mmCIF file of C-alpha atoms and ligand atoms in Angstrom:
data_model
loop_
_atom_site.group_PDB
_atom_site.id
_atom_site.type_symbol
_atom_site.label_atom_id
_atom_site.label_comp_id
_atom_site.label_asym_id
_atom_site.label_seq_id
_atom_site.Cartn_x
_atom_site.Cartn_y
_atom_site.Cartn_z
ATOM 1 C CA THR A 1 -4.877 -83.998 40.175
ATOM 2 C CA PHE A 2 -7.156 -84.716 37.205
ATOM 3 C CA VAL A 3 -10.556 -83.070 36.694
ATOM 4 C CA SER A 4 -13.122 -84.179 34.104
ATOM 5 C CA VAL A 5 -16.196 -82.049 33.400
ATOM 6 C CA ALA A 6 -18.722 -81.744 30.594
ATOM 7 C CA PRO A 7 -18.747 -78.535 28.514
ATOM 8 C CA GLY A 8 -21.126 -75.878 29.791
ATOM 9 C CA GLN A 9 -20.953 -77.135 33.389
ATOM 10 C CA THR A 10 -19.339 -75.682 36.518
ATOM 11 C CA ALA A 11 -15.928 -77.026 37.547
ATOM 12 C CA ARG A 12 -13.940 -76.485 40.743
ATOM 13 C CA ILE A 13 -10.155 -76.577 41.164
ATOM 14 C CA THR A 14 -8.561 -77.019 44.594
ATOM 15 C CA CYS A 15 -4.938 -75.942 45.022
ATOM 16 C CA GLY A 16 -2.603 -75.355 47.946
ATOM 17 C CA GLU A 17 -2.441 -76.468 51.563
ATOM 18 C CA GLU A 18 -5.062 -75.768 54.253
ATOM 19 C CA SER A 19 -5.404 -72.148 55.337
ATOM 20 C CA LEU A 20 -3.325 -71.084 58.340
ATOM 21 C CA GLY A 21 -3.347 -67.280 58.157
ATOM 22 C CA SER A 22 -4.687 -64.565 55.871
ATOM 23 C CA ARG A 23 -4.519 -65.510 52.189
ATOM 24 C CA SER A 24 -3.846 -63.485 49.039
ATOM 25 C CA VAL A 25 -3.936 -66.238 46.417
ATOM 26 C CA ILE A 26 -2.754 -65.582 42.853
ATOM 27 C CA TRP A 27 -3.988 -67.810 40.023
ATOM 28 C CA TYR A 28 -2.640 -68.308 36.508
ATOM 29 C CA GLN A 29 -3.766 -70.097 33.350
ATOM 30 C CA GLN A 30 -1.117 -71.548 31.024
ATOM 31 C CA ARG A 31 -2.095 -72.903 27.624
ATOM 32 C CA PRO A 32 0.190 -75.618 26.192
ATOM 33 C CA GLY A 33 3.055 -74.067 24.261
ATOM 34 C CA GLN A 34 2.290 -70.641 25.760
ATOM 35 C CA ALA A 35 2.981 -68.647 28.936
ATOM 36 C CA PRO A 36 0.669 -68.085 31.916
ATOM 37 C CA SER A 37 -1.292 -64.856 32.227
ATOM 38 C CA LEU A 38 -2.922 -62.805 34.972
ATOM 39 C CA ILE A 39 -6.136 -64.491 36.136
ATOM 40 C CA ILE A 40 -7.030 -63.686 39.773
ATOM 41 C CA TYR A 41 -5.490 -61.375 42.367
ATOM 42 C CA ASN A 42 -6.784 -60.646 45.904
ATOM 43 C CA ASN A 43 -8.773 -63.929 45.537
ATOM 44 C CA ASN A 44 -11.692 -62.283 43.724
ATOM 45 C CA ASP A 45 -10.350 -59.299 41.733
ATOM 46 C CA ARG A 46 -9.522 -59.282 38.027
ATOM 47 C CA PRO A 47 -8.038 -56.712 35.634
ATOM 48 C CA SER A 48 -9.906 -55.427 32.599
ATOM 49 C CA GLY A 49 -10.242 -57.790 29.637
ATOM 50 C CA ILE A 50 -11.797 -60.960 31.097
ATOM 51 C CA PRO A 51 -15.451 -61.625 32.069
ATOM 52 C CA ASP A 52 -17.024 -62.449 35.440
ATOM 53 C CA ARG A 53 -17.189 -66.197 34.713
ATOM 54 C CA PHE A 54 -14.012 -66.692 36.786
ATOM 55 C CA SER A 55 -14.662 -66.795 40.537
ATOM 56 C CA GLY A 56 -12.485 -67.617 43.520
ATOM 57 C CA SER A 57 -13.123 -68.453 47.143
ATOM 58 C CA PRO A 58 -12.261 -65.649 49.593
ATOM 59 C CA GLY A 59 -9.468 -66.132 52.093
ATOM 60 C CA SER A 60 -11.657 -65.664 55.171
ATOM 61 C CA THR A 61 -12.759 -69.062 56.514
ATOM 62 C CA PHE A 62 -9.643 -70.386 58.244
ATOM 63 C CA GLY A 63 -8.889 -74.090 58.042
ATOM 64 C CA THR A 64 -10.037 -74.390 54.409
ATOM 65 C CA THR A 65 -8.363 -74.416 50.987
ATOM 66 C CA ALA A 66 -8.324 -71.808 48.234
ATOM 67 C CA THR A 67 -10.607 -72.842 45.383
ATOM 68 C CA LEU A 68 -11.094 -71.736 41.776
ATOM 69 C CA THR A 69 -14.655 -72.005 40.443
ATOM 70 C CA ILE A 70 -15.408 -71.579 36.731
ATOM 71 C CA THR A 71 -18.989 -71.394 35.450
ATOM 72 C CA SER A 72 -19.970 -72.688 31.981
ATOM 73 C CA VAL A 73 -16.596 -74.126 30.995
ATOM 74 C CA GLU A 74 -16.106 -74.232 27.222
ATOM 75 C CA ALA A 75 -13.573 -76.037 25.051
ATOM 76 C CA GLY A 76 -10.882 -73.343 25.034
ATOM 77 C CA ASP A 77 -10.569 -73.309 28.835
ATOM 78 C CA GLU A 78 -8.490 -76.520 28.849
ATOM 79 C CA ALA A 79 -5.159 -75.219 30.161
ATOM 80 C CA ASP A 80 -2.786 -75.745 33.071
ATOM 81 C CA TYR A 81 -3.638 -73.854 36.269
ATOM 82 C CA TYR A 82 -1.113 -72.967 38.973
ATOM 83 C CA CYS A 83 -1.768 -71.363 42.360
ATOM 84 C CA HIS A 84 0.478 -68.942 44.248
ATOM 85 C CA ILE A 85 0.344 -68.591 48.031
ATOM 86 C CA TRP A 86 0.899 -65.497 50.165
ATOM 87 C CA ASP A 87 0.344 -65.995 53.895
ATOM 88 C CA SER A 88 0.912 -63.805 56.946
ATOM 89 C CA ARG A 89 2.081 -66.784 59.037
ATOM 90 C CA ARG A 90 3.928 -68.740 56.312
ATOM 91 C CA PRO A 91 7.085 -67.463 54.571
ATOM 92 C CA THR A 92 6.886 -65.990 51.087
ATOM 93 C CA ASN A 93 6.735 -68.780 48.511
ATOM 94 C CA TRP A 94 9.409 -68.496 45.816
ATOM 95 C CA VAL A 95 7.991 -71.529 43.961
ATOM 96 C CA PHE A 96 4.504 -71.915 42.517
ATOM 97 C CA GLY A 97 2.075 -74.530 43.771
ATOM 98 C CA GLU A 98 1.382 -77.901 42.211
ATOM 99 C CA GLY A 99 -0.610 -77.694 39.003
ATOM 100 C CA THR A 100 -4.077 -79.076 38.352
ATOM 101 C CA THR A 101 -5.134 -80.388 34.937
ATOM 102 C CA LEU A 102 -8.806 -80.164 33.954
ATOM 103 C CA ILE A 103 -10.295 -82.121 31.044
ATOM 104 C CA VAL A 104 -13.166 -80.785 28.924
ATOM 105 C CA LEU A 105 -15.220 -83.489 27.216
ATOM 106 C CA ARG B 1 -6.826 -58.574 72.496
ATOM 107 C CA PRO B 2 -7.062 -59.946 68.955
ATOM 108 C CA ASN B 3 -5.453 -63.381 68.757
ATOM 109 C CA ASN B 4 -8.303 -65.964 68.943
ATOM 110 C CA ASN B 5 -6.366 -68.183 71.324
ATOM 111 C CA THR B 6 -7.421 -71.810 71.646
ATOM 112 C CA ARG B 7 -7.916 -73.844 74.838
ATOM 113 C CA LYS B 8 -5.479 -76.653 75.691
ATOM 114 C CA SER B 9 -5.061 -78.521 78.987
ATOM 115 C CA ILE B 10 -1.831 -80.020 80.351
ATOM 116 C CA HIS B 11 -1.929 -82.680 83.061
ATOM 117 C CA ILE B 12 0.239 -82.034 86.125
ATOM 118 C CA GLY B 13 -0.588 -84.572 88.807
ATOM 119 C CA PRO B 14 -3.348 -85.907 91.050
ATOM 120 C CA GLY B 15 -6.624 -84.180 90.203
ATOM 121 C CA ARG B 16 -5.027 -81.041 88.777
ATOM 122 C CA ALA B 17 -4.364 -79.374 85.440
ATOM 123 C CA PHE B 18 -2.433 -76.441 83.969
ATOM 124 C CA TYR B 19 -4.376 -74.617 81.267
ATOM 125 C CA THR B 20 -2.395 -72.723 78.609
ATOM 126 C CA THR B 21 -2.690 -71.530 75.029
ATOM 127 C CA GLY B 22 -1.923 -74.311 72.568
ATOM 128 C CA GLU B 23 -1.900 -72.490 69.237
ATOM 129 C CA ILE B 24 -2.970 -69.200 67.668
ATOM 130 C CA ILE B 25 -5.824 -69.636 65.189
ATOM 131 C CA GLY B 26 -5.934 -67.050 62.420
ATOM 132 C CA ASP B 27 -3.737 -63.960 62.126
ATOM 133 C CA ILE B 28 -1.371 -62.950 64.922
ATOM 134 C CA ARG B 29 -1.494 -59.350 66.143
ATOM 135 C CA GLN B 30 -0.750 -57.176 69.180
ATOM 136 C CA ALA B 31 -2.742 -55.728 72.069
ATOM 137 C CA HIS B 32 -3.662 -52.054 71.744
ATOM 138 C CA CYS B 33 -6.211 -49.515 72.973
ATOM 139 C CA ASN B 34 -7.673 -46.485 71.205
ATOM 140 C CA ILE B 35 -7.976 -43.063 72.799
ATOM 141 C CA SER B 36 -9.884 -40.625 70.596
ATOM 142 C CA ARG B 37 -8.318 -37.269 69.761
ATOM 143 C CA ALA B 38 -10.151 -33.979 70.410
ATOM 144 C CA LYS B 39 -11.148 -35.664 73.692
ATOM 145 C CA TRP B 40 -7.821 -36.166 75.521
ATOM 146 C CA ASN B 41 -5.845 -33.095 74.426
ATOM 147 C CA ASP B 42 -8.944 -30.984 75.081
ATOM 148 C CA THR B 43 -9.273 -32.632 78.494
ATOM 149 C CA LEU B 44 -5.564 -32.097 79.197
ATOM 150 C CA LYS B 45 -6.347 -28.389 78.833
ATOM 151 C CA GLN B 46 -9.069 -28.812 81.467
ATOM 152 C CA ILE B 47 -6.494 -30.100 83.966
ATOM 153 C CA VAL B 48 -3.988 -27.293 83.391
ATOM 154 C CA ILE B 49 -6.555 -24.507 83.899
ATOM 155 C CA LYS B 50 -7.223 -25.710 87.443
ATOM 156 C CA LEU B 51 -3.499 -26.446 87.737
ATOM 157 C CA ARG B 52 -2.935 -22.767 86.840
ATOM 158 C CA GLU B 53 -4.478 -21.763 90.199
ATOM 159 C CA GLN C 1 1.196 -51.557 24.687
ATOM 160 C CA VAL C 2 4.330 -52.857 26.413
ATOM 161 C CA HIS C 3 6.155 -55.522 24.389
ATOM 162 C CA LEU C 4 9.151 -57.466 25.709
ATOM 163 C CA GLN C 5 11.687 -59.521 23.753
ATOM 164 C CA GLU C 6 14.504 -61.659 25.155
ATOM 165 C CA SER C 7 17.807 -62.614 23.537
ATOM 166 C CA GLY C 8 20.607 -64.914 24.624
ATOM 167 C CA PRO C 9 23.321 -67.349 23.534
ATOM 168 C CA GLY C 10 21.059 -70.412 23.731
ATOM 169 C CA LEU C 11 23.779 -72.948 24.561
ATOM 170 C CA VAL C 12 25.975 -72.281 27.607
ATOM 171 C CA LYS C 13 28.903 -74.392 28.784
ATOM 172 C CA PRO C 14 29.020 -75.438 32.459
ATOM 173 C CA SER C 15 30.718 -73.117 34.977
ATOM 174 C CA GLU C 16 30.195 -70.141 32.639
ATOM 175 C CA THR C 17 28.565 -66.748 33.162
ATOM 176 C CA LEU C 18 25.119 -66.580 31.544
ATOM 177 C CA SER C 19 23.821 -63.179 30.422
ATOM 178 C CA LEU C 20 20.375 -62.219 29.127
ATOM 179 C CA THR C 21 19.042 -59.126 27.365
ATOM 180 C CA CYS C 22 15.411 -58.033 27.775
ATOM 181 C CA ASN C 23 14.254 -55.465 25.225
ATOM 182 C CA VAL C 24 11.710 -53.009 26.656
ATOM 183 C CA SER C 25 9.398 -50.978 24.418
ATOM 184 C CA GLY C 26 6.491 -48.653 25.118
ATOM 185 C CA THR C 27 7.516 -47.765 28.682
ATOM 186 C CA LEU C 28 10.428 -46.578 30.808
ATOM 187 C CA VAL C 29 12.389 -49.103 32.862
ATOM 188 C CA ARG C 30 12.784 -46.655 35.765
ATOM 189 C CA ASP C 31 9.061 -46.366 36.559
ATOM 190 C CA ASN C 32 8.281 -50.099 36.866
ATOM 191 C CA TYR C 33 9.522 -53.094 38.823
ATOM 192 C CA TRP C 34 11.242 -55.870 36.875
ATOM 193 C CA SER C 35 11.647 -59.550 37.714
ATOM 194 C CA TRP C 36 12.923 -62.729 36.066
ATOM 195 C CA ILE C 37 11.235 -66.142 36.209
ATOM 196 C CA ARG C 38 12.979 -69.436 35.399
ATOM 197 C CA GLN C 39 10.644 -72.307 34.486
ATOM 198 C CA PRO C 40 11.902 -75.913 34.267
ATOM 199 C CA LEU C 41 10.400 -78.249 31.698
ATOM 200 C CA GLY C 42 7.474 -80.164 33.161
ATOM 201 C CA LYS C 43 7.726 -78.278 36.467
ATOM 202 C CA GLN C 44 6.223 -75.211 38.099
ATOM 203 C CA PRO C 45 7.815 -71.805 37.407
ATOM 204 C CA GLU C 46 10.505 -70.638 39.825
ATOM 205 C CA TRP C 47 10.858 -67.004 40.890
ATOM 206 C CA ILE C 48 14.290 -65.386 41.194
ATOM 207 C CA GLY C 49 13.730 -61.837 42.424
ATOM 208 C CA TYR C 50 12.531 -58.303 41.670
ATOM 209 C CA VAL C 51 14.823 -55.350 40.962
ATOM 210 C CA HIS C 52 14.367 -51.574 40.866
ATOM 211 C CA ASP C 53 16.645 -48.585 40.345
ATOM 212 C CA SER C 54 15.779 -47.037 43.731
ATOM 213 C CA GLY C 55 17.476 -49.927 45.564
ATOM 214 C CA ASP C 56 14.358 -51.785 46.765
ATOM 215 C CA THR C 57 15.667 -55.116 45.502
ATOM 216 C CA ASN C 58 15.568 -58.554 47.127
ATOM 217 C CA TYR C 59 16.844 -61.917 45.904
ATOM 218 C CA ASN C 60 16.117 -65.582 46.489
ATOM 219 C CA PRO C 61 18.255 -66.774 49.443
ATOM 220 C CA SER C 62 18.903 -70.049 47.597
ATOM 221 C CA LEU C 63 20.463 -68.146 44.664
ATOM 222 C CA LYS C 64 21.563 -64.921 46.393
ATOM 223 C CA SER C 65 25.316 -65.488 46.036
ATOM 224 C CA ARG C 66 25.222 -66.365 42.315
ATOM 225 C CA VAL C 67 22.851 -63.862 40.651
ATOM 226 C CA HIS C 68 23.421 -60.248 39.611
ATOM 227 C CA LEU C 69 20.930 -57.768 38.157
ATOM 228 C CA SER C 70 21.547 -54.496 36.339
ATOM 229 C CA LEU C 71 19.590 -51.866 34.423
ATOM 230 C CA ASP C 72 20.602 -50.024 31.243
ATOM 231 C CA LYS C 73 18.898 -46.625 31.258
ATOM 232 C CA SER C 74 20.563 -45.527 28.006
ATOM 233 C CA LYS C 75 19.414 -48.563 25.995
ATOM 234 C CA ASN C 76 16.197 -49.312 27.978
ATOM 235 C CA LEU C 77 16.953 -52.978 28.638
ATOM 236 C CA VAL C 78 17.189 -55.305 31.640
ATOM 237 C CA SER C 79 20.082 -57.748 32.032
ATOM 238 C CA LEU C 80 20.751 -60.661 34.380
ATOM 239 C CA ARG C 81 24.009 -62.421 35.231
ATOM 240 C CA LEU C 82 24.377 -65.894 36.741
ATOM 241 C CA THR C 83 27.681 -67.594 37.565
ATOM 242 C CA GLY C 84 28.414 -71.214 38.406
ATOM 243 C CA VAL C 85 25.627 -72.641 36.260
ATOM 244 C CA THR C 86 24.836 -76.350 36.623
ATOM 245 C CA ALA C 87 22.789 -78.955 34.767
ATOM 246 C CA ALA C 88 19.804 -78.247 37.045
ATOM 247 C CA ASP C 89 19.535 -74.748 35.518
ATOM 248 C CA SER C 90 18.410 -76.099 32.116
ATOM 249 C CA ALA C 91 15.099 -74.240 31.867
ATOM 250 C CA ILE C 92 13.392 -71.274 30.175
ATOM 251 C CA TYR C 93 13.980 -67.677 31.249
ATOM 252 C CA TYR C 94 11.251 -65.034 31.250
ATOM 253 C CA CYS C 95 11.310 -61.237 31.470
ATOM 254 C CA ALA C 96 8.047 -59.914 32.896
ATOM 255 C CA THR C 97 6.635 -56.783 34.488
ATOM 256 C CA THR C 98 5.980 -56.541 38.223
ATOM 257 C CA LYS C 99 3.481 -54.394 40.126
ATOM 258 C CA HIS C 100 3.379 -53.996 43.903
ATOM 259 C CA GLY C 101 0.293 -54.418 46.055
ATOM 260 C CA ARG C 102 -0.465 -53.563 49.666
ATOM 261 C CA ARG C 103 -2.371 -55.895 52.002
ATOM 262 C CA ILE C 104 -3.569 -54.088 55.136
ATOM 263 C CA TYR C 105 -5.191 -56.466 57.661
ATOM 264 C CA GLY C 106 -4.739 -54.822 61.042
ATOM 265 C CA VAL C 107 -3.416 -51.529 62.338
ATOM 266 C CA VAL C 108 -1.668 -49.479 59.653
ATOM 267 C CA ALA C 109 1.132 -48.780 62.148
ATOM 268 C CA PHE C 110 3.122 -51.319 64.248
ATOM 269 C CA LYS C 111 4.508 -52.977 61.046
ATOM 270 C CA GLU C 112 2.009 -55.824 60.751
ATOM 271 C CA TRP C 113 1.157 -55.440 57.056
ATOM 272 C CA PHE C 114 2.938 -57.384 54.321
ATOM 273 C CA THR C 115 3.222 -56.411 50.665
ATOM 274 C CA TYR C 116 2.818 -58.674 47.638
ATOM 275 C CA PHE C 117 3.946 -58.686 44.010
ATOM 276 C CA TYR C 118 2.175 -59.847 40.856
ATOM 277 C CA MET C 119 3.175 -60.071 37.195
ATOM 278 C CA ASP C 120 1.129 -58.076 34.675
ATOM 279 C CA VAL C 121 2.864 -58.264 31.272
ATOM 280 C CA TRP C 122 5.039 -61.236 30.311
ATOM 281 C CA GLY C 123 7.644 -61.731 27.612
ATOM 282 C CA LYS C 124 7.755 -64.351 24.889
ATOM 283 C CA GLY C 125 10.593 -66.226 26.600
ATOM 284 C CA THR C 126 13.879 -67.674 25.388
ATOM 285 C CA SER C 127 15.278 -71.194 25.636
ATOM 286 C CA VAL C 128 18.568 -71.729 27.485
ATOM 287 C CA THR C 129 20.301 -75.119 27.393
ATOM 288 C CA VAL C 130 23.275 -75.945 29.630
ATOM 289 C CA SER C 131 25.436 -78.828 28.419
ATOM 290 C CA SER C 132 29.090 -79.754 28.010
HETATM 291 C C1 LIG D 201 -8.706 -48.388 66.984
HETATM 292 O O1 LIG D 201 -8.710 -49.746 67.338
HETATM 293 C C2 LIG D 201 -9.293 -50.536 66.295
HETATM 294 C C3 LIG D 201 -9.485 -51.930 66.846
HETATM 295 O O2 LIG D 201 -10.162 -51.901 68.095
HETATM 296 C C4 LIG D 201 -8.424 -50.492 65.037
HETATM 297 O O3 LIG D 201 -9.223 -51.110 64.032
HETATM 298 C C5 LIG D 201 -8.540 -51.593 62.868
HETATM 299 O O4 LIG D 201 -8.616 -50.628 61.810
HETATM 300 C C6 LIG D 201 -7.986 -51.026 60.585
HETATM 301 C C7 LIG D 201 -8.090 -49.853 59.639
HETATM 302 O O5 LIG D 201 -6.942 -49.018 59.721
HETATM 303 C C8 LIG D 201 -8.661 -52.286 60.056
HETATM 304 O O6 LIG D 201 -8.026 -52.692 58.848
HETATM 305 C C9 LIG D 201 -9.049 -52.989 57.873
HETATM 306 O O7 LIG D 201 -9.198 -54.395 57.759
HETATM 307 C C10 LIG D 201 -10.199 -54.815 56.826
HETATM 308 C C11 LIG D 201 -10.320 -56.316 56.950
HETATM 309 O O8 LIG D 201 -11.110 -56.809 55.878
HETATM 310 C C12 LIG D 201 -10.594 -58.107 55.513
HETATM 311 O O9 LIG D 201 -10.897 -59.068 56.522
HETATM 312 C C13 LIG D 201 -12.290 -59.395 56.693
HETATM 313 C C14 LIG D 201 -12.386 -60.351 57.865
HETATM 314 O O10 LIG D 201 -11.378 -61.344 57.707
HETATM 315 C C15 LIG D 201 -12.809 -60.000 55.391
HETATM 316 O O11 LIG D 201 -14.178 -60.341 55.545
HETATM 317 C C16 LIG D 201 -12.646 -58.985 54.248
HETATM 318 O O12 LIG D 201 -13.109 -59.569 53.034
HETATM 319 C C17 LIG D 201 -13.446 -58.537 52.084
HETATM 320 O O13 LIG D 201 -12.432 -58.422 51.109
HETATM 321 C C18 LIG D 201 -12.172 -59.627 50.364
HETATM 322 C C19 LIG D 201 -10.975 -59.362 49.474
HETATM 323 O O14 LIG D 201 -9.835 -59.180 50.309
HETATM 324 C C20 LIG D 201 -13.444 -60.006 49.584
HETATM 325 O O15 LIG D 201 -13.227 -61.218 48.885
HETATM 326 C C21 LIG D 201 -14.625 -60.167 50.564
HETATM 327 O O16 LIG D 201 -15.816 -60.478 49.850
HETATM 328 C C22 LIG D 201 -14.798 -58.923 51.445
HETATM 329 O O17 LIG D 201 -15.273 -57.897 50.572
HETATM 330 C C23 LIG D 201 -11.194 -58.495 54.124
HETATM 331 O O18 LIG D 201 -10.471 -59.571 53.522
HETATM 332 C C24 LIG D 201 -9.766 -54.353 55.427
HETATM 333 O O19 LIG D 201 -10.736 -54.747 54.474
HETATM 334 C C25 LIG D 201 -9.609 -52.823 55.419
HETATM 335 O O20 LIG D 201 -9.181 -52.382 54.134
HETATM 336 C C26 LIG D 201 -9.386 -50.956 54.035
HETATM 337 O O21 LIG D 201 -8.460 -50.379 53.121
HETATM 338 C C27 LIG D 201 -8.594 -50.795 51.744
HETATM 339 C C28 LIG D 201 -7.479 -50.137 50.955
HETATM 340 O O22 LIG D 201 -7.505 -48.741 51.231
HETATM 341 C C29 LIG D 201 -9.992 -50.406 51.244
HETATM 342 O O23 LIG D 201 -10.145 -50.817 49.896
HETATM 343 C C30 LIG D 201 -11.052 -51.083 52.128
HETATM 344 O O24 LIG D 201 -12.359 -50.753 51.668
HETATM 345 C C31 LIG D 201 -10.861 -50.715 53.601
HETATM 346 O O25 LIG D 201 -11.214 -49.335 53.705
HETATM 347 C C32 LIG D 201 -8.653 -52.355 56.520
HETATM 348 O O26 LIG D 201 -7.374 -52.793 56.133
HETATM 349 C C33 LIG D 201 -8.579 -53.383 61.110
HETATM 350 O O27 LIG D 201 -9.268 -54.549 60.677
HETATM 351 C C34 LIG D 201 -9.190 -52.900 62.422
HETATM 352 N N1 LIG D 201 -9.069 -53.922 63.450
HETATM 353 C C35 LIG D 201 -10.087 -54.297 64.232
HETATM 354 C C36 LIG D 201 -9.783 -55.366 65.238
HETATM 355 O O28 LIG D 201 -11.203 -53.794 64.133
HETATM 356 C C37 LIG D 201 -8.090 -49.056 64.628
HETATM 357 O O29 LIG D 201 -6.988 -49.028 63.727
HETATM 358 C C38 LIG D 201 -7.728 -48.167 65.827
HETATM 359 N N2 LIG D 201 -7.640 -46.767 65.427
HETATM 360 C C39 LIG D 201 -8.644 -46.032 64.915
HETATM 361 C C40 LIG D 201 -8.296 -44.619 64.559
HETATM 362 O O30 LIG D 201 -9.780 -46.476 64.754
HETATM 363 C C1 LIG D 202 5.542 -75.708 68.654
HETATM 364 O O1 LIG D 202 6.497 -76.787 68.817
HETATM 365 C C2 LIG D 202 6.040 -78.088 68.415
HETATM 366 C C3 LIG D 202 7.165 -79.051 68.717
HETATM 367 O O2 LIG D 202 6.949 -79.734 69.943
HETATM 368 C C4 LIG D 202 5.657 -78.057 66.937
HETATM 369 O O3 LIG D 202 5.248 -79.340 66.467
HETATM 370 C C5 LIG D 202 4.042 -79.856 67.064
HETATM 371 O O4 LIG D 202 4.341 -80.906 67.993
HETATM 372 C C6 LIG D 202 3.192 -81.483 68.633
HETATM 373 C C7 LIG D 202 3.712 -82.508 69.616
HETATM 374 O O5 LIG D 202 4.291 -83.619 68.947
HETATM 375 C C8 LIG D 202 2.259 -82.081 67.585
HETATM 376 O O6 LIG D 202 1.090 -82.579 68.226
HETATM 377 C C9 LIG D 202 1.881 -81.022 66.557
HETATM 378 O O7 LIG D 202 1.102 -81.607 65.521
HETATM 379 C C10 LIG D 202 3.135 -80.391 65.957
HETATM 380 N N1 LIG D 202 2.778 -79.342 65.017
HETATM 381 C C11 LIG D 202 2.707 -79.537 63.696
HETATM 382 C C12 LIG D 202 2.324 -78.345 62.875
HETATM 383 O O8 LIG D 202 2.941 -80.629 63.188
HETATM 384 C C13 LIG D 202 4.583 -77.003 66.708
HETATM 385 O O9 LIG D 202 4.258 -76.928 65.325
HETATM 386 C C14 LIG D 202 5.080 -75.639 67.189
HETATM 387 N N2 LIG D 202 4.079 -74.600 66.969
HETATM 388 C C15 LIG D 202 2.859 -74.550 67.531
HETATM 389 C C16 LIG D 202 2.014 -73.375 67.139
HETATM 390 O O10 LIG D 202 2.451 -75.406 68.314
HETATM 391 C C1 NAG D 203 -12.068 -67.930 66.483
HETATM 392 O O1 NAG D 203 -11.804 -69.318 66.222
HETATM 393 C C2 NAG D 203 -12.962 -70.159 66.340
HETATM 394 C C3 NAG D 203 -12.491 -71.580 66.141
HETATM 395 O O2 NAG D 203 -11.574 -71.970 67.155
HETATM 396 C C4 NAG D 203 -14.018 -69.729 65.326
HETATM 397 O O3 NAG D 203 -15.186 -70.524 65.500
HETATM 398 C C5 NAG D 203 -14.357 -68.256 65.511
HETATM 399 O O4 NAG D 203 -15.246 -67.828 64.485
HETATM 400 C C6 NAG D 203 -13.091 -67.403 65.474
HETATM 401 N N1 NAG D 203 -13.407 -66.008 65.736
HETATM 402 C C7 NAG D 203 -12.769 -64.990 65.149
HETATM 403 C C8 NAG D 203 -13.227 -63.617 65.538
HETATM 404 O O5 NAG D 203 -11.863 -65.170 64.343
HETATM 405 C C1 NAG D 204 -6.593 -31.208 69.960
HETATM 406 O O1 NAG D 204 -6.830 -32.254 69.004
HETATM 407 C C2 NAG D 204 -7.728 -31.884 67.946
HETATM 408 C C3 NAG D 204 -7.931 -33.117 67.095
HETATM 409 O O2 NAG D 204 -7.125 -33.079 65.926
HETATM 410 C C4 NAG D 204 -7.155 -30.706 67.165
HETATM 411 O O3 NAG D 204 -8.089 -30.302 66.170
HETATM 412 C C5 NAG D 204 -6.859 -29.543 68.103
HETATM 413 O O4 NAG D 204 -6.209 -28.497 67.391
HETATM 414 C C6 NAG D 204 -5.971 -30.000 69.257
HETATM 415 N N1 NAG D 204 -5.749 -28.910 70.194
HETATM 416 C C7 NAG D 204 -4.565 -28.670 70.769
HETATM 417 C C8 NAG D 204 -4.516 -27.504 71.709
HETATM 418 O O5 NAG D 204 -3.580 -29.366 70.542
#
């Protein structure tokens, strides 16, 4: 979908279907004209090089959706986000989830 | 018995019902039971001493 | 740091065999998992499969009978082969690293756990166009 948020505010991105089993959701950020990069693994863990401003909902509460929450969004954060799904009850997804476009005013 | 089974009712006939599991909520698993070590193999030695009589 | 560069013919005729070359620098190809990702224009990226020299290699069932992977230990490069290409394959290839992760939610025995894969270092990418 489309998300509009003022700079410096907190935005939320919802991706994927409702939770059915245990989740290990992988997130990516793809700038236009570039390639996606590692953002979130294990739904809250990040590699070295990026700050703690990126947060994700844990895959514990069943019957919900995985959510990406970004605090104090600035102008350079406007990029395509794609979610990847790993589930213990669903088969391994060989295609990424539907993208979500956020707009920074 | 970790499954978190739900509770569904199926109608049979006059004033009766047949209750089964409808779906499994969460992660599916198996039934298992722990038995701590250094408590069973030590106790198996206790049996064989009196069985050595 | 690990830097990856891809090369190819660019334009491929239909029903031809498409081959790619992925230059690997700064690391050994034997000690890491390798995978290829094909991304259509305006669509989400599509994953093909991950390959390793030890034989722990699985492929997409939709494209199992048409893809082939190989490793060049002497030249330190990764190559892919695809036969019976169609117009739906007009996309962008990518050569990226792959690291394995273990998710343990339950008993460590009884084969309940499932493993996952994530991509750490990505290549620049090369454009492949299929037309007559
Ligand atoms: C005896 O019988 C008992 C049962 O009666 C058996 O008990 C089982 O033991 C195994 C250990 O071998 C247990 O596996 C562990 O599972 C936990 C589960 O945590 C996850 O699920 C939680 C509930 O859904 C959730 O809250 C957790 O969330 C945390 O993590 C997320 C990120 O994923 C984060 O966002 C959250 O904020 C939380 O921080 C979590 O998702 C799992 O965490 C354990 O991991 C271990 O290993 C890793 C890697 O080494 C390590 O990093 C961890 O710290 C941890 O040490 C582990 O896999 C299983 O759950 C038990 N089952 C039951 C029913 O209790 C037992 O095996 C039998 N034998 C013996 C000898 O006891
Ligand atoms: C079990 O089989 C049924 C087929 O009868 C699957 O589909 C369900 O069918 C019932 C009856 O029409 C519906 O009420 C459910 O909504 C259907 N399920 C879904 C997900 O749409 C069902 O999915 C199978 N599995 C389970 C766990 O029930
Ligand atoms: C089991 O499922 C119910 C919902 O049907 C939920 O309220 C409860 O917290 C669950 N318990 C466990 C241990 O998963
Ligand atoms: C019994 O089990 C304990 C637990 O590991 C072990 O230390 C001990 O050596 C065992 N004894 C015998 C006789 O097997």
